[PDB]
């Protein structure tokens, strides 16, 4: 009990940066309760730069070992559509991850207050899929794809974030089985805790497409647990606003929201899909952001 | 209903 705490803390120490970041970070401004703790922005004293700091209490996780994943897996990851992690530290009983601050905030604010058009939807889906093709080719599953995990720059550039539940697969351990995600976005094979791969993020992306069209995921008013039962048991959920979606968006969505995971399109395939040729540039997103509306 | 919060099953606790 105390023994498992102390061991866990020593283990994490081997993968985090040594040192106390409190000596260099000032002006903490809370922006969220995120997945697994609080997210603040702060100023780096030596550079004047703003960063985002996620702080996760070691004693408050459902599965403490998941805290190993992001801090190891995302360590020196560079991709234009993925939130960059700068360092991590152990501060008392908290893990702090310091990362790039996305001043445009999250896609959730948009999707609940406005209606994206298909140009904008394709731009988001292209960005996310560029991120997921590269991630998935090196064994990394995100496992919490939803609008809250998509962040924006001031000029409409899109980046994937919230890697806290991400997982690494490999040749010798190619599948995971953990019930991890956000209930309404979870793939049905993951709900059933069957072995699963990168395919799970493709299904969640489908649900996020439903968010972008309808405003919310299917069965959102149902309590989480029954909603999960429905997803597991029913046929693919349908858009409420289907009459407003183009034939190419419908055909795109049909390749995402497939139950049989071996039939579901991969990110690399979806990158070639004609829906994505409608993608707008970063500027097309900017009108939707809270500050411009 | 309408919850945006993640769920992690503590299956090994």
Author numbering:
A (entry chain A): 297 to 589
B (entry chain B): 178 to 190
Sentences from the paper on this structure:
On the basis of these experiments, we hypothesize that Inka1 stabilizes the ATP-bound crystallization-competent conformation of the kinase domain by preventing ATP hydrolysis through binding tightly in the cleft between the N- and C-lobes. This in-cellulo iBox–PAK4cat structure determined in space group P63 was verified by comparison with the structure of the complex determined at 2.0 Å resolution from P41212 crystals grown in vitro from purified PAK4cat and a synthetic iBox 24mer peptide. The packing between the N-lobes, as observed in the in-cellulo P63 crystal form, is also reproduced in the in-vitro P41212 crystal reported here and elsewhere121431424344, and in an in-vitro P212121 crystal, demonstrating that this interaction is conducive for crystallization. These two crystal forms support a range of apo peptide inhibitors and small-molecule inhibitor complexes with PAK4cat. The disposition of the core Inka1 sequence (RSRQPLVLGD) in the current structure shows docking in to the substrate-binding pocket (primarily via R-2 and R-4 interactions) and the inhibitor chain runs parallel to, and hydrogen bonds with, several main-chain residues of the activation loop in a β-sheet-like manner. The AID and Inka1 structures similarly feature Arg-mediated salt bridges that bind an acidic pocket and hydrophobic side-chain interactions at the +2 and +3 positions.
PAK4 is a kinase with strong links to cellular transformation and cancer metastasis, as reviewed. We have shown that Cdc42 directly regulates PAK4 activity in mammalian cells through an auto-inhibitory domain (AID) that binds in a manner similar to pseudosubstrates. We have identified Inka1 as a potent vertebrate inhibitor of PAK4 with a Ki of ∼30 nM, which has a much higher affinity than the corresponding AID. The recombinant 38 amino acid ‘Inka box' (GST-iBox) is a potent of PAK4cat inhibitor in vitro but does not affect PAK1, suggesting Inka1 is a specific group II PAK30 inhibitor.
